[PDB]
Design a protein around this motif. Sequence first.
Motif, PDB file in Angstrom:
ATOM      1  N   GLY A 198       0.790  -1.236   0.000  1.00  0.00           N
ATOM      2  CA  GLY A 198       0.000   0.000   0.000  1.00  0.00           C
ATOM      3  C   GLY A 198       0.819   1.281   0.000  1.00  0.00           C
ATOM      4  N   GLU A 223       4.022  -0.431   6.140  1.00  0.00           N
ATOM      5  CA  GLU A 223       2.902  -0.544   5.205  1.00  0.00           C
ATOM      6  C   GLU A 223       1.966   0.660   5.230  1.00  0.00           C
ATOM      7  OE1 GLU A 223       2.421  -5.316   5.904  1.00  0.00           O
ATOM      8  OE2 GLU A 223       1.026  -4.424   4.458  1.00  0.00           O
ATOM      9  N   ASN A 224       1.232   0.833   4.127  1.00  0.00           N
ATOM     10  CA  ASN A 224       0.245   1.909   3.924  1.00  0.00           C
ATOM     11  C   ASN A 224       0.829   3.324   4.085  1.00  0.00           C
ATOM     12  OD1 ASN A 224      -2.866   0.668   3.655  1.00  0.00           O
ATOM     13  ND2 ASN A 224      -1.429  -0.701   4.713  1.00  0.00           N
ATOM     14  N   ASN A 250       4.011   2.145  10.389  1.00  0.00           N
ATOM     15  CA  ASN A 250       2.865   1.882   9.517  1.00  0.00           C
ATOM     16  C   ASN A 250       1.833   3.005   9.548  1.00  0.00           C
ATOM     17  OD1 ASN A 250       3.621  -1.034   8.801  1.00  0.00           O
ATOM     18  ND2 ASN A 250       3.491  -1.168  11.038  1.00  0.00           N
ATOM     19  N   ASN A 251       1.163   3.206   8.408  1.00  0.00           N
ATOM     20  CA  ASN A 251       0.100   4.209   8.217  1.00  0.00           C
ATOM     21  C   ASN A 251       0.565   5.655   8.466  1.00  0.00           C
ATOM     22  OD1 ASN A 251      -2.775   2.537   7.843  1.00  0.00           O
ATOM     23  ND2 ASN A 251      -1.273   1.435   9.106  1.00  0.00           N
TER      24      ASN A 251
END
Lengths: 302, 431, 355, 345
Positions: free
Chosen positions: B331, B347-348, B364-365
């Motif tokens: 992502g 991720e993301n 992450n995010n």
Amino acid sequence: FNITETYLRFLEEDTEMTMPIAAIEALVTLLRIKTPETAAEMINTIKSSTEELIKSIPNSVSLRAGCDIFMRFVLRNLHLYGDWENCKQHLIENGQLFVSRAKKSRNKIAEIGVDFIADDDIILVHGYSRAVFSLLNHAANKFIRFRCVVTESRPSKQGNQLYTLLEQKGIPVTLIVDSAVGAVIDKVDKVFVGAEGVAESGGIINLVGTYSVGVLAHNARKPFYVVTESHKFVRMFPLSSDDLPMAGPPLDFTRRTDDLEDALRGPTIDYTAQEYITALITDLGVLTPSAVSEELIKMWYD
Amino acid sequence: EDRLQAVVLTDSYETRFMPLTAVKPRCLLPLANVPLIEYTLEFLAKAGVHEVFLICSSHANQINDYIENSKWNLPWSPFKITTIMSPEARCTGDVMRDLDNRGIITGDFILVSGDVLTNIDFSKMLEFHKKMHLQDKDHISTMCLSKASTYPKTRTIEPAAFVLDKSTSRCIYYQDLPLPSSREKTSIQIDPELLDNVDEFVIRNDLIDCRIDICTSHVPLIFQENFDYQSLRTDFVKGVISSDILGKHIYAYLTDEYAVRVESWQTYDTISQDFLGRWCYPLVLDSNIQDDQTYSYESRHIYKEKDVVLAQSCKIGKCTAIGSGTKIGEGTKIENSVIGRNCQIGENIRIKNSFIWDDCIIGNNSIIDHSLIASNATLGSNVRLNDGCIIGFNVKIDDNMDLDRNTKISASPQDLDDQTLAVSIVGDKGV
Amino acid sequence: PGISSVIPTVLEQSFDNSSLISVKELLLNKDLIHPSILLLTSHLAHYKIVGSIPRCIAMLEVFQIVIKDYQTPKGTTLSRNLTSYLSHQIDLLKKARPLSVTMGNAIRWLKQEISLIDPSTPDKAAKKDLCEKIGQFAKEKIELADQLIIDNASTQIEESTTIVTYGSSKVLTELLLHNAISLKKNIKVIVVDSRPLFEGRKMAETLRNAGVNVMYALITSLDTIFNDVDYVFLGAHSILSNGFLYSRAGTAMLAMSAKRRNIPVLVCCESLKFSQRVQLDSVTFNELADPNDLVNIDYENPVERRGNKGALLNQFIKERKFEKKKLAMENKPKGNKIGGKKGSEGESKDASNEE
Amino acid sequence: HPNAATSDVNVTIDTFVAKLKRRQVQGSYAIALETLQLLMRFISAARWNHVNDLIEQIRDLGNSLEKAHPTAFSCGNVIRRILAVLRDEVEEDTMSTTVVAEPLISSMFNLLQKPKTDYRQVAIQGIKDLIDEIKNIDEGIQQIAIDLIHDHEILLTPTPDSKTVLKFLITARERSNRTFTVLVTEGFPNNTKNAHEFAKKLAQHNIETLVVPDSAVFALMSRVGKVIIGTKAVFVNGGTISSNSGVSSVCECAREFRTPVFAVAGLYKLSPLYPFDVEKFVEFGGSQRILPRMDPRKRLDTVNQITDYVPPENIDIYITNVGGFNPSFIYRIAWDNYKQIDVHL
């Protein structure tokens, strides 16, 4: 009063009442109840019912095409500024006359389109349309020699359905898979197809493997046929090879699975270009290339 | 014509980079995952230098150790590096007098202040310097100039207006102006002593400074004679022109091709974007100069080194570069951004126009937009950043953190907000 | 009367079908010609922006100016020396730059309007209604028709798509501007350009001014940019009764590559663009221009170098010839957008009979 | 193996490395000559006494040389060529030190049946023969090539950069019995200057010269007789990397019009490497030469590439010093000069 419910009632019927002609007959019945005298009250509610029909559609194209022709005929009725009553009576009557025209057209084609199948020719037939099979049956009625090759189409298993309907007639057959369909084009004289729709461009709207048939035949120089009844014309122009109206999947790639459930997903309806069609047959004469567009230009007046 | 010696001015533009240069030196910082000095040294090798000099004082030990590890201590090298150790923080004039006292300068020498990357061949420059030196005896130093990036409406840090000859290409005036950044001054006063000697006056602000010099044996003698001159451009060039010694000449060289000296953060950002683009035709990542480099060009200006690891179904953008031994999660969007060697990414994560150096872990995010990250620093989860947000060395930003425009973070554990330790001034922590 | 004969460069052994000459710098002319014509001829001689569509719009506006400036003589009526004056205009236009198809349909419309109005009505009442009709004609056949092409294309293009284009066609610029701003999609637009003129550069510049993700490319670099692309839009000039696409320079090359690399070709057109003339190859009737534009090492347009090339006349056979208006093959394009919505290229003359 | 042992004895290793990286060295012909002189210096100066330790050292040197510059295939091939010349003479030498060795022909199938001297002198002469081969290729081309082109036939030419092809064209124009019209695609971003020099040398010899813009290639393809390629490097599958710009489209244009495609090359130019992806092998250009001004270049991400690749589907003949061969056979010519192990250095 419902229109989708009236179309759903045709389950064990079919064959005679063609899918669009039954939807057109359902459109006329809905028209004749709530007075066709008013053009504001009726036409708007007809448009809402067609919109409700499109929203309920999963994978059908021809029902949208058939609505257009109906609309066109309705508008053309009182184009002579005639009595708002004799024009109306002619409009209501042209519902049963529309279904009666499906029989007359089939009577025309089955005597015209038997000429294409010559003395002793092996045919590879793909798809199932009521016009193409009626050619095949009324050529056997004409006592003409022809062999038949069945294509293993995979929608709701159509090949097996086609094979059984050929057995009921008395014509020798064998199953050919759509993977191996390339290995058949040497012992086949002509390739035939039945379409779900015919494009504005001159291309075709068809099943789960028809473009693939069209290209292979173009390679082998062996003729490619499209036979239908003249009502499956939409003002549709699929610009690319993989672009069509869909309610389901336009090629989906799924995540890692162990139970094995999400797999099948592939383009169930595929387009083929104008060049691949050698010949096209309808009741509106014998015509193929630019003919479809001229029909649509004549109808739409645009 | 042969035998050329070069002097490099380092420890010169420190603290001009505000949050950094705290623990490690100015020129150690990577442009495209490789130190700034390496670019300059490559320019020296392409020019044809036989003897190299460097000026180190602040963080000098780290510089000397880096030269020990460098590709030039090895015997096969065309040049040998000798470091000058001086008192902590002094002007360019003070170093010039120190070198003249030591006395190593022979004939024509080279002086570069700051680190410059250019694709311009120097062999042409040397010839035109020598041709003009043979024209008249009292001729001093050479200056490089390039045509500006369209119009310098965004360029405010370098407002140097040059008055030049059409026939002899001699500089007349140097002037700095605030103008669109600070609307205060408008006036520029010019000396009328040099009017009919030139006739063809050409005034231009549309020229980028380079601060690269070919200099004669006169220069260190003049610096010792006139010890009032601290700078080399603002006071020195103007002083030379305005009848200090009568009949003395200085060069100004015009070149159509790319040559930009690094000085500020937003200039550094433009040069880096020019390097990711194909502006410097020879100077591209794929050629590999540091030898350890294994970068390969991919279409749509995407750079990847060897051993690049990426998670499936991920979109990469335009003008991007990723180092070796790097892992990326699902992502992720990487658009117009540089990520260093051995950098693990979660991720993301959406990245646009940003910057990340070597060995950095991102939580992450997180969304990062037009903002810089230094080496061995970690980003947490749920991190949102804005334009011009430079993050220092070893800075551990914890989970759930939002920072607005131009929020600079210190590299040392003083005056500016946010430090190096866990939860950096979102709850009072830090030495 | 004008300047005729005596031409720069060699007569050429291959390709000599059309005139290669003309007046760029004004020397010896008639003192009756309206200056707006003289401006347009000097424009089109060294024009960088125009490509079929805008040329006719300018030609219409110039005509509107002439009629507004026209005062009927007391002796000679309206249809006496007007048509001779218009024939002088066209001949001066022909000397400067060969006319487009849309220009011809405009002239034919105007000559029909001259015959329609009889010299009996008052002069000020005549021209007042005439220019109103031209304005309505320009509204219908261009502006409103253009908007119809816009919305027809809008349904055709999928969400978040990559498009490669060519030229400087007015219809396509507005198309892409409609995509970026009014609809708001993720449109990656790649623009290609040749050597004689930087049409694509100008289009890309205008797209940059809108703020579009634009890549700019060249014909040499095609087999790298494709290996991404989904749709290709071509700036139409004229589609013949055959169905062949007579368009600008680097058009067919793109069309060929597209057909072979699966993705289709789309062409936006006008109902005024169709002609009844026919041809099958690029050699037939070409819009040739002087090699003077191809002398310099390009980069921009005026650089003035002491380079490698210079001599054309004195050199023993060195034909540095280039074409401008070329032909795309029939089968390759798939969609055409016009006043009558849609229709494939094999159905070309369904507009000419419909009129 | 590093260059720590070869530094005082051999200096020219690092000067060639410098010539590649900054592109001071230009044209595959020149790169080959330098590597020949490198291997000339390596044998003349070194002391080894052992053979297998020597060969594996050469393999590591070639491995480092190709890692230093990926577009220097002529560098990689020349080493591989001498490697195989070495390996045959070693296998001949081992048969005499031990003491049918002649089944039928010179095949392959290395997966079936199992297994002081003047060797260094042979290695010396082996380099000398390679030089003389690279010195004279044109003589071997002209005897095969000037047999295929007719009178009143029009020749379209991408890549005017090759010295090999131009000299092939001038030998044919020397024949007063042969007349041909030459179309030349410009190749804007790179080839322009070279294309203009190409057009000048054709006029110098008085051959009907026609300069073509890269857009107009289609507008002429109906009239074109033949297509000729000035390739840089030829591959196993048949395909070529050519000396920059506007070839791939021209070849695509030719194949659609079914116009024949010719290629002029050398065996040293021929490579035993396989192009699994064009993405890695092709070198990209400098976008500076396209568009000025850097503030619009933030939004103007321009794409330009030097080297152009052609797939084997288009070209039909590779006329060398040996002869004319089809792309479906060229692999054998390669294996006749380079061994299977001498690929992954």
